[PDB]
Amino acid sequence: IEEGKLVIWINGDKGYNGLAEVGKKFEKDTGIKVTVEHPDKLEEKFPQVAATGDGPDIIFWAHDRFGGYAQSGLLAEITPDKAFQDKLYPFTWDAVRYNGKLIAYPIAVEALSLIYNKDLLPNPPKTWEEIPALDKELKAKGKSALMFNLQEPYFTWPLIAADGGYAFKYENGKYDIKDVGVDNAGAKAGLTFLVDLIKNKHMNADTDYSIAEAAFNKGETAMTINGPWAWSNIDTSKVNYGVTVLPTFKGQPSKPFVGVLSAGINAASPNKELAKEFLENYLLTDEGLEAVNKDKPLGAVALKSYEEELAKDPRIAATMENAQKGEIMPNIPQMSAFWYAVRTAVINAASGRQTVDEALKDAQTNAAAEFIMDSDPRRCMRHHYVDSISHPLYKCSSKMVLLARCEGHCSQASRSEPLVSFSTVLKQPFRSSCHCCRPQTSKLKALRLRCSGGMRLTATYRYILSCHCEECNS
């Protein structure tokens, strides 16, 4: 990571250009260059580079992943003062509190809603059951009822939860990670009903995010399911759309998982004070959030003063209504195993590869399984960096070269104890043990430098291949 700059990662479906305009204001006032990138598989890529002490200074994702990140030590603790705390809704801070500490800044509260084409469906269905009969008549006109992203369980979860599916049972303000509601009767009814939509050719097993967005925005489908970030494309879309409450299933409301979009600071960032100023003084203001909201809407934001202005919009109202019927995601580390499990279950049952309940029988135990964790970045390890090698005195061409270094905190305590002697001899007076993070293996390297004009010098240096914790006086 580079000192004197901010690299920020946020999902490609969110308003990164808006966020980059906030970045520009910050550059103007401080000189600090903000870079906003949006890799794919972001929620997976961050722990992978951050475990190596690399990655962005700031990471944005819904709060359900952040418990996991914090456990492995990827996230700094954040230090908003009380005055800043009060500018945001307390329940949004709760979503980012983990083992008693705030591990990210909440930005916006997200929930799925039903997005409907008012010209094909003046009156959108209040229940899921009436969808087959409504797809019936739309297809008679060259359209379809409903498309949504079938590849991410986030979009199907609301339906599975409806009849009593749940992730980990929540009671007494705590989740029991051995009490998983993924193959109960309710989850079965929910998932089977989706599988029926597909078998009865009302939906298409392969339908993904862009396919659903295309279909709805070209007005070939009457409904889709999505979050506030999609709205932006539908205005400029030739579509006259509404945003409403999700339909009910077996008489019960759809229970979307609610996510608080959040910004965490990489524990490895040499730019924490910058990230703090950026987030508190630039992003989380009326104008910062407006800039992002202009690009891709955030939904019900977490800053009160700005949510007060946005609240007079039916679309936000609907987002909230849907939020209220749904439940906030836990942020506990076990969530990454739950999501993996449900993603397999749904894709498998949708594509015919397993029966429902033959898929959710497996997701049931898969969701409570122990998982491999992100290694902790404080451990002794090897770092790659690029440096230009120069002569200390003579004027020469300098080369840019990849080098490696060792850094970390050896876990063993260091100790020192007296030795006794009678030997009038010299001696070390102390027996000690101290572990240092050091090269275990390395190889010799040589580089020709060109000097003006006498003469060609050869610089040697060792290239470190591996590090380990070894005794100091070895």
Ligand X SMILES: OC[C@H]1O[C@H](O[C@H]2[C@H](O)[C@@H](O)[C@@H](O)O[C@@H]2CO)[C@H](O)[C@@H](O)[C@@H]1O
Please provide residue 320's backbone torsions phi and psi, each rounded to the nearest 5 degrees: -65, -40
**CA-to-CA separations, 389 to 22, 163, 338, in angstroms, rounded:** 37, 65, 49
**CA-to-CA separations, 213 to 218, 225, 266, in angstroms, rounded:** 8, 9, 33
| 146 contacts a copy of itself (rule: CB under 8 A) | no
Contact partner, 123, from a copy of itself, ligand X, none, Cβ < 5-8 Å per class: none
Contact partner, 421, from a copy of itself, ligand X, none, Cβ < 5-8 Å per class: a copy of itself
In the shown chain, the binding pattern of residues 82 to 121 toward a copy of itself, with x for contact by CB under 8 A and - for none, equals: x-------x---x---xxxx--------------------
Least distance between ligand X and beta carbon 64 (Å) = 5
- Candidates 140, 386, 413, 455: give the one binding a copy of itself (CB under 8 A): 413
Q: Which of 160, 166, 152, 112 is nearest to 356 (CA)?
A: 160
Q: Are 58 and 8 contacting, i.e. CB atoms less than 8 angstroms apart?
A: yes
Contact stretch for ligand X (CB under 6 A) within 125-133, 149-157, 288-296, 400-408? 149-157
Contact stretch for a copy of itself (CB under 8 A) within 56-64, 241-249, 359-367, 418-426? 418-426
Least distance between a copy of itself and beta carbon 105 (Å) = 18
Strands (E), 154-240: 166-171, 174-181, 221-226
Least distance between ligand X and beta carbon 111 (Å) = 10
Please provide residue 455's backbone torsions phi and psi, each rounded to the nearest 5 degrees: -130, -175
Contact partner, 187, from a copy of itself, ligand X, none, Cβ < 5-8 Å per class: none
Least distance between ligand X and beta carbon 343 (Å) = 6
Least distance between a copy of itself and beta carbon 401 (Å) = 9
Taking the alpha carbons at both ends of the chain, their separation in whole angstroms is 33
- DSSP class of 158: H
| 15 contacts ligand X (rule: CB under 6 A) | no
Contact stretch for a copy of itself (CB under 8 A) within 15-23, 109-117, 195-203, 437-445? 437-445
| 3 state SS of 335 | helix
| 458 contacts a copy of itself (rule: CB under 8 A) | yes
| 214 contacts a copy of itself (rule: CB under 8 A) | no
Q: Which of 394, 386, 385 is nearest to 459 (CA)?
A: 394
Q: Are 100 and 230 contacting, i.e. CB atoms less than 8 angstroms apart?
A: no
| 436 contacts a copy of itself (rule: CB under 8 A) | yes
Output the six-digit token pair for 147: 């498309």
Looking up tokens 């925005």 gives 217
Q: Which of 147, 145, 166, 195 is nearest to 347 (CA)?
A: 195
Least distance between ligand X and beta carbon 128 (Å) = 20
Angle formed at CA 388 by CA 387 and CA 392, multiple of 5 degrees: 120
Residue closer to a copy of itself (CB basis): 134 or 368: 368
| 3 state SS of 195 | helix
Residues that bind a copy of itself (CB under 8 A): 82, 90, 94, 98-101, 172-173, 178, 378, 380, 389, 391, 403-411, 413-422, 429-430, 432, 434-439, 442, 457-464, 467, 472-473
Residues that bind ligand X (CB under 6 A): 11, 13, 43, 62, 64-65, 110, 152-154, 259, 261, 339
